[PDB]
Amino acid sequence: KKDNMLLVDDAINDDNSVIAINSNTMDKLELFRGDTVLVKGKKRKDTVLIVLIDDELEDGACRINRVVRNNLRIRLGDLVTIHPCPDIKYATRISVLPIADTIEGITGNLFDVFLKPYFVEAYRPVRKGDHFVVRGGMRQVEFKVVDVEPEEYAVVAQDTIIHWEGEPINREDEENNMNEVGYDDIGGCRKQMAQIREMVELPLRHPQLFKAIGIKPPRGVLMYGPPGTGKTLMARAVANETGAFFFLINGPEVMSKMAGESESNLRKAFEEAEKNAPAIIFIDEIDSIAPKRDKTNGEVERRVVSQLLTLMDGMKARSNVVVIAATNRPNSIDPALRRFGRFDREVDIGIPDATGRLEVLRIHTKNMKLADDVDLEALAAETHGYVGADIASLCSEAAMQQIREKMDLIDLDEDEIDAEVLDSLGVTMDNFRFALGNSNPSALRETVVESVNVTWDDVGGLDEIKEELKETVEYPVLHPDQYTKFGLSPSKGVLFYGPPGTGKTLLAKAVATEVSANFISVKGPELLSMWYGESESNIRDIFDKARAAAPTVVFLDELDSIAKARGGDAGGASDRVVNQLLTEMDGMNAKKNVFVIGATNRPDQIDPAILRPGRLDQLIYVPLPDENARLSILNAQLRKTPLEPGLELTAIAKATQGFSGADLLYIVQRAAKYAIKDSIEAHRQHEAEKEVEPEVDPVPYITKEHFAEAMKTAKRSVSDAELRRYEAYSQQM
Amino acid sequence: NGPEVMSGESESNLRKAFEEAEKNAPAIIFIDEIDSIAPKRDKTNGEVERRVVSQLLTLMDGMKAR
Ligand SMILES: Nc1ncnc2c1ncn2[C@@H]1O[C@H](COP(=O)(O)OP(=O)(O)O)[C@@H](O)[C@H]1O
Ligand SMILES: Nc1ncnc2c1ncn2[C@@H]1O[C@H](COP(=O)(O)OP(=O)(O)O)[C@@H](O)[C@H]1O
Ligand code: BEF
Ligand code: BEF
Ligand SMILES: [Mg+2]
Ligand SMILES: [Mg+2]
Numbered sequence: 001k002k003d004n005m006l007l008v009d010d011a012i013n014d015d016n017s018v019i020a021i022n023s024n025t026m027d028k029l030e031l032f033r034g035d036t037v038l039v040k041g042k043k044r045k046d047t048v049l050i051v052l053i054d055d056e057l058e059d060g061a062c063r064i065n066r067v068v069r070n071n072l073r074i075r076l077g078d079l080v081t082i083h084p085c086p087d088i089k090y091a092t093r094i095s096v097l098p099i100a101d102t103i104e105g106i107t108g109n110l111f112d113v114f115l116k117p118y119f120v121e122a123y124r125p126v127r128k129g130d131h132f133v134v135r136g137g138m139r140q141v142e143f144k145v146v147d148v149e150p151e152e153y154a155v156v157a158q159d160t161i162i163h164w165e166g167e168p169i170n171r172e173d174e175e176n177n178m179n180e181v182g183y184d185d186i187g188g189c190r191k192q193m194a195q196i197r198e199m200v201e202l203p204l205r206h207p208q209l210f211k212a213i214g215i216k217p218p219r220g221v222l223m224y225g226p227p228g229t230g231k232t233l234m235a236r237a238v239a240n241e242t243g244a245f246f247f248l249i250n251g252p253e254v255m256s257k258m259a260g261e262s263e264s265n266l267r268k269a270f271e272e273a274e275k276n277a278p279a280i281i282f283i284d285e286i287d288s289i290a291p292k293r294d295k296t297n298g299e300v301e302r303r304v305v306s307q308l309l310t311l312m313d314g315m316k317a318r319s320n321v322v323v324i325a326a327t328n329r330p331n332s333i334d335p336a337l338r339r340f341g342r343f344d345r346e347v348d349i350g351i352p353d354a355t356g357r358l359e360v361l362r363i364h365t366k367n368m369k370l371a372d373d374v375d376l377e378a379l380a381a382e383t384h385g386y387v388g389a390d391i392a393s394l395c396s397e398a399a400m401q402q403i404r405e406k407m408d409l410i411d412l413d414e415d416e417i418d419a420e421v422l423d424s425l426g427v428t429m430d431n432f433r434f435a436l437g438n439s440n441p442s443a444l445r446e447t448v449v450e451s452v453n454v455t456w457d458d459v460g461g462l463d464e465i466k467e468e469l470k471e472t473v474e475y476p477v478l479h480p481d482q483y484t485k486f487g488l489s490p491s492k493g494v495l496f497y498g499p500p501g502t503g504k505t506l507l508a509k510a511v512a513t514e515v516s517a518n519f520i521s522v523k524g525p526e527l528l529s530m531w532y533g534e535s536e537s538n539i540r541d542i543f544d545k546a547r548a549a550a551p552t553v554v555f556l557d558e559l560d561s562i563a564k565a566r567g568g569d570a571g572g573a574s575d576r577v578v579n580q581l582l583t584e585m586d587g588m589n590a591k592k593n594v595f596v597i598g599a600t601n602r603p604d605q606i607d608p609a610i611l612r613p614g615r616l617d618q619l620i621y622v623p624l625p626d627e628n629a630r631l632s633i634l635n636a637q638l639r640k641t642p643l644e645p646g647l648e649l650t651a652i653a654k655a656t657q658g659f660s661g662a663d664l665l666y667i668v669q670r671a672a673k674y675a676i677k678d679s680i681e682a683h684r685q686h687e688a689e690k691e692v693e694p695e696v697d698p699v700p701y702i703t704k705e706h707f708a709e710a711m712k713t714a715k716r717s718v719s720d721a722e723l724r725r726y727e728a729y730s731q732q733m
Numbered sequence: 734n735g736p737e738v739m740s741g742e743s744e745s746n747l748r749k750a751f752e753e754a755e756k757n758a759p760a761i762i763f764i765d766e767i768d769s770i771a772p773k774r775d776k777t778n779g780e781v782e783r784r785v786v787s788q789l790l791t792l793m794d795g796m797k798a799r
Contacts, residue, residue: 293736294779302740335769336736 003028005081007061008074012054016132017124019082020054020063028059031084036125036155038085039064041072043182044241048088048125048153071130088125088153091160095147099131100168102142111164114141119156127153131172144172183237186230187363188356192347193234196221199345200238203322204278219315219322222346224330226548228389228442229349231326235282238324245276251285254304262300263307270311278320286325290334305334312342351387351550354380360391368399371428379432384477385441385518385549395427397435402427443548447520452509459506460636460661461629465620469494469507470515472618476593477517477551492588493616495559495606496599498726499718501662502622504599508555511597517551524558528577535573536580543584550592559598563607578607585615603729621730624660624723627653633661637668644701652707660717670710675702735769743781744788751792 003025013020019039021031031037031051040046047068057063062082064072074080098110114134118124126132130145143164148154156162186193202209203217210217223231239246249269254262273279283289289308291301315321325343327333337343352360357380365376386394402425410421440448459466476483476490483490496504512519520542527538546554556562562581564574588594596616600606610616625633634649652667682698738746754762764770770789772782 293739306740 003059004083005079008069008072008076008078008080009057009061009063010076011063011065012056013052013063014065016065016067017049017122017126018065019049019051019068020057021051022055022057022059023053025057025059026053035084036086036088037082038153039068039072039080039082041074041080042078043073043179044243045071045073045129046127046153047071047130048085048127050125067131067133071127085153088155089150090123090157091126091154092149093161093163094126094145094154094156096143096145096162096164097167097169098164099142099144099172100170102140103168106137106139110141110166111162113137115143115162115164119160119162121158123155123157123160125153125155178236179240181233181236182241185363186233186237187359188352189230189349192349195345195347196234196238199322200242200280203320204242204244204280207320217322218345220312220343220345221322221324222333222343223324223326223349224328224346225349226351226387226443227328228387229351230388231349232284234349235284235324235326238280239282242280245273245279247273247279247281249281249283251283251288254289260300260303262304266304266307266311273321274319281321281323283323283325286327287329287332290332290337292332292334293336305336309336309342351385351548357383357386357391360388364392365395365427368427369425371426373429374432379436381478382436382516384516384551385444387442390439390442394432394435394439397439398427398431401431401434401438405431441518441549443545444518444520444552447522447542447545449512449519449521452513454506454509454513456510456514458636458639459503459510460633461625462503462507462622463632465622466507466510469511469620473511473515473517473553473595489590491618492594493585493596494598494618494620495603495611495616496597496620496622497603497729498622499624499660499722500601501660501717502624503661504622505557507622508557508597508599511553511555515553517553518549519553519555520546520549521555521557524561527562528573536576539577539580539584546594547592550594553595553597555597555599557599559600559610560602560605563610565605565607578610582609582615585610604725619733624658624718630656630659630664633664634668637661637665641672642701644703647702647704647707652711656714658716658718659714663714663717667707667710667714670713671702671706674706674709675699678706735764735766738770738785739781743785747785747788747792755796
C-alpha cells in the first residue's frame, strides 16, 4: 500500500482552500505548511489546497471542509489520491461567477464585498470548475471558477486579476446531473461492467499493451438484452468518466427534409469525432437505422446503411475511436453490420440475481430518510422477476404510498407548506409491502392475471398431493444447493389428469397466489391465429416473456387443443403448433428455470411426443375425494360463512359417496340461495307488518332445513363410464 | 458473398462479376452463402430477390464453351 492515498474526514480548519495532514504523515511524505497540493478524487475531478499540520488528523485520512469535499465529488469516508504540484504558479486572471440561487435578493458590487477580502493576501490555489463559498452580509454566496489563464489551476496573488461578471445562472445544477453518475451507480452487472471498462480504457489510453501481446483491440461493442437493464446508464457513465469528446447522435434523428444530406450528417459526425481527439461514439437505437435489409422497401435507408458501413470500415490505426450501440431486440440486426470488423464483442447484460437485486436496492434507496425496521434481504429474496427499472419504480411507489399515508391525518394544508411534517418522514416496511403487492414486472405487464384470493388452506383435501406439489415447485428456484448436491437434471414440466370438478384449476390458482414466484396463464386455443406465422409467433413471444422474467410458471390450460393427437388434415397448422411447442420446450437447460404446468380433462388425446420422458415426465393423478377429503372440502368451502353451531357435516360426508367438490359447492350454493330466499320473505313480511321488529337478519345462520332442502336435487357430476376410462388410463400409465 | 450484392444494380453487379470472370481468363468464381441470394423462391415474397434469382439463373445458363 502506497501511503499516498487517503480517506476524507471531517474538517477542523473551516477555511475553504485548505486540507489538514498529520505530522507523522509529513515525515512519511515530505510536505509543508505553505505547500500547495493537488487533490484528485473520483469522477475524474481535481482541486488544489494548502496542507497544514493537524494533530487530530491521524495519518491514514485527511480533513477537508465540505467545499473541497464537494468539488472532488466525494463524501466523508471516501478515498482520494493526494500529490503535490509546485509547477502551478501565480495567476494572470480569473473568471468567477455567482450561482443564481445564492444571490437571489441582493445586487451591486460582489467583488468589493465578497471576492476582494476572500482572495486578498491569501494567494489561494484555485482550479477551473471549482465552486467556493464566501460568507458575508448575512448570507453565503457561491461562485464557480469558469476560467483561468495559467492552465487548469493557478494561484491568486495580489497582482492576479479577478474578473467577476453578473451572470446568475441555473446551469450548475443541470451540469452536475449530466456529469453525475459514474460507475458506482450500476450494481449487479460486475462482469459486463469490467468488460465495458476494459473496452473503453485499454484501446483509448494505452494501446502499447495490445501492441506488446499482439491482439488487435476491437472498435465496436453491441449491447442487447431485456429493456430496462442499464445500457443507457453504462453509456452515461462512460461519457462522464472521461473528459474527451462525446458526439451523441441517435437513430431516427440523423434524417433531414432536404435532398439527401443524412450521409453528410453521418460524415460530419465522424469527422468531428476524428478532428478533436481519440474519442467515443454512442449511437442509440440502431434498429431504426439497420432494417436488417429484408423488410425495407426504400432507397434512402439503404443508402444510410451503406454510408454507415463505409464510415465504419474505413478506420485506420491512427484514428483510434470505438463505438457503442445500445439495442433493444437482438434479432432484427443486419448481418452485413454484424460482419467481422465492425461489431464483434456483444455483451449480454441479463437479469440480476438475488445478490444483484440487493446491490440495486442498496444503490437506489440509500439516499433517503428510510426507516428503522427495514431488511433489504427479504425484499430481494421475495422479488424474483424484476430488472433494472422496476426496483426504482418500487421505491417510487413506496415513497408515494408513504406520502399518501402521512397526508390524511396530519393535515398538510396544501395552500401553504409547513416545516413539521417534512422531517418526520420514513418509508417503513408497510409501504414497501404495499408497493410490492401493487406492482408487476415490466415484461409481464401485457399478460397480467387478475387476483384470485385463494390460499393453500382453501383447497380442501389432497394433502400429500399439494405438499409434494409445493415442494417440487419450491425446490429449484430458491435453494439450488440440494440440486447441486443431488447431481441430477430436474423435471421441467408437470401434468394434471382426472375427472372434471376435482381441483386442478384450483391448484393452479393456489400456485398463482401463494408460491412466491411469478405466474403467466394462457387459455387453450387463445394462441392461434388465421394468418401465416402468427400462430407460432404467439407461442414464441409468450415463451420469450417466460424466459425473460425468470423464474415463472406457464400454466398451459386444456392441452387437448394445443397438443392435439396427429392421426387428411386442414393444411398442417396444428402440426406446426406442436412442432413449435416441442422446439421451444426442448431448449430448457439448468438456466432460466421455468416450469410448464398442464391440466386436461381427457388424457387420451395428448401427444406422446409431448408426454415423452425428458420433455414432460411428471404425471400426478387427482382422484375422486374420499370420506375425509370430502369432509375437508365441506369444511374449506364453509370458511367465511356464518354457519350454525349445532350443525355437522359428517352426515353430508357419509350420505354422499361418489360426489365431487363442484356439486358439493352446488349444494352449498343452493342452501345459501334458500337462506337468501327465506331472508327476502322474512324482510317483506316485516315490511308488510310494519306498514300495516326482528334483528338485523331474521335468519343469521344457514339452518339444517336449508341443507336438507338443497340436497333434494343434488345430482352427481361424473358418470360411471368416465371413471372406468380414467381407471383404465391409470392402469395403463 | 451473398448479401453484398444489393444497393436496379444487383443485376448490374451480377453481370459485372460474370463478365469480369469471363473476360480475363478461364477462372473460378466463389459465391459464399448462397442462402441469402436464393431464398428458395416459394417462401419468399419480395421482388428484387426474384429478379436477382432470375438474373443468376439466366447468367449461369449463358456460359458457352469458350
Ligand atoms: N443495472 C442497474 N443498476 C442500477 N440502476 C439501474 C439499472 N438498470 C436500470 N437502472 C435504473 O433505471 C432507470 C432508467 O434506466 P435507463 O438507463 O434509462 O435504462 P436503459 O439502459 O434500459 O435505457 C434509472 O433510474 C437507472 O438508475
Ligand atoms: N378439492 C377441492 N377443495 C375445495 N374446493 C374444490 C375442490 N375441488 C373442486 N373445488 C371447487 O370446484 C370449483 C371449480 O373447480 P375447478 O378447479 O375449476 O375444477 P377442475 O378440477 O375441473 O379444473 C371451485 O369453486 C372450487 O372451490
Ligand atoms: F434496456 Be433499456 F430499456 F434501454
Ligand atoms: F377443469 Be375441470 F377438469 F372441469
Ligand atoms: Mg436506453
Ligand atoms: Mg380447469
